[PDB]
Amino acid sequence: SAVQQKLAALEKSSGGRLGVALIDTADNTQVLYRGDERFPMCSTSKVMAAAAVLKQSETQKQLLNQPVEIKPADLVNYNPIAEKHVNGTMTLAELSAAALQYSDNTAMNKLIAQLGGPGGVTAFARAIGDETFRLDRTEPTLNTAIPGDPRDTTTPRAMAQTLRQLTLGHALGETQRAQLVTWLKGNTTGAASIRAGLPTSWTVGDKTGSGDYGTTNDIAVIWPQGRAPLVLVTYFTQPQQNAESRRDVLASAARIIAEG
Ligand SMILES: *C(=O)N1C[C@H](NOS(=O)(=O)O)CC[C@H]1C(N)=O
């Protein structure tokens, strides 16, 4: 297929390893490139942690309003929102929003804590039928993105399927799903990734991530106007530990998928 040849060429031009999964919910068709290879998730894993807490809130109806202390000891490498509330509290809703929309790593660690450790996040993946996702570590070490290391990885195919179920499907209750969709649509970190390769008019909710080995990721739900939505996962990683991020590769992959 032409899309396959163009993604392969993009990959060749980039010097890295590119993973793409597209699901067209119009006809449930899929486009995959290295769809079954493992990639480090880095911050894209936060969608699963947030969704897991939302699933808890279906029975614990006030859970999202639960205050959680932010202490100095809780701060890690990237805490844009949590640092604003040190020695105070944030609710689990606020932590979820911070994790998703600003990619706050302290917020992610509080979500993991709420779920009883990385094993609790992974259990939620298994619960909704994702047998591929694995979260092994907490922030910041889950972003080491070491080649061949299976920790904290998933595949593009798996992540696309799961993101579909969480946002467009019914893995979550209706109020929860709507909340997740709202958070994703309000992401502030994605302008140069998938979004940059799509028609400006299209509505996108996404979660970015990056890590060592120039790992550069984005997962997205896309709502074209007058057309069934799409799920697009783009993972990218490189052979040098100190490689720079390549968000342009993700934008380019999205463009190739969109029809450009
Ligand atoms: C997620 O991959 N991380 C936390 C934060 N994410 O910002 S990003 O999604 O815009 O890339 C910074 C990078 C990364 C990390 N190494 O902690």
Residue numbers in the entry: 27 to 57, 59 to 238, 240 to 288
Give passages from the manuscript.
We further demonstrate that MHz SFX is suitable for structural discovery by determining the structure of a so far unknown complex of a β-lactamase from K. pneumoniae. This enzyme belongs to the extended spectrum β-lactamases (ESBLs) that play an important role in emerging multi-antibiotic resistance mechanisms. To obtain structural insights into the molecular basis and spectrum of CTX-M-14 inhibition, we analyzed the complex with the inhibitor avibactam. The crystals are in a space group with only one molecule in the asymmetric unit (AU), an active site fully accessible to solvent, and were soaked with avibactam just before the SFX data collection. The SFX data collected to 1.7 Å show a complex with diazabicyclooctane avibactam, covalently bound to OG of Ser70 of the β-lactamase, as also reported similar by King et al. for other β-lactamases. The electron density as well as the resulted and refined model are of high quality, without any indication of radiation damage and show avibactam complexed covalently to OG of Ser70 of the β-lactamase. Measurements for CTX-M-14 β-lactamase were made in the same manner as for HEWL, except the EuXFEL delivered 300 pulses per second with a mean photon energy of 9.15 keV and a higher mean pulse energy of 1.05 mJ per pulse, giving an absorbed dose of 0.9 MGy using RADDOSE-3D version 2.122. Merging reflection intensities using the program partialator in CrystFEL produced a data set with an error metric Rsplit of 0.197 and CC* of 0.984 to 1.7 Å resolution. In particular, the structural data obtained for the CTX-M14 avibactam complex demonstrates the potential of megahertz SFX for structural discovery at newly available high repetition rate sources, opening up new possibilities for rapid screening for drug targets using on-the-fly substrate mixing, while the potential for rapid data acquisition will facilitate the generation of time-resolved movies of macromolecules in action at physiological temperature.
Here, we show that high-quality structures can indeed be obtained using 1.1 MHz repetition rate pulses from the European XFEL using currently available operating conditions (September 2017 and March 2018, proposal p2012). We present two complete data sets, one from the well-known model system in crystallography, lysozyme and the other from a so far unknown complex of a β-lactamase from Klebsiella pneumoniae involved in antibiotic resistance. The results obtained for HEWL and CTX-M-14 demonstrate that SFX using X-ray pulses with megahertz repetition rates is suitable for high-resolution structure determination using the methods described in this paper under the exposure conditions currently available at the European XFEL.
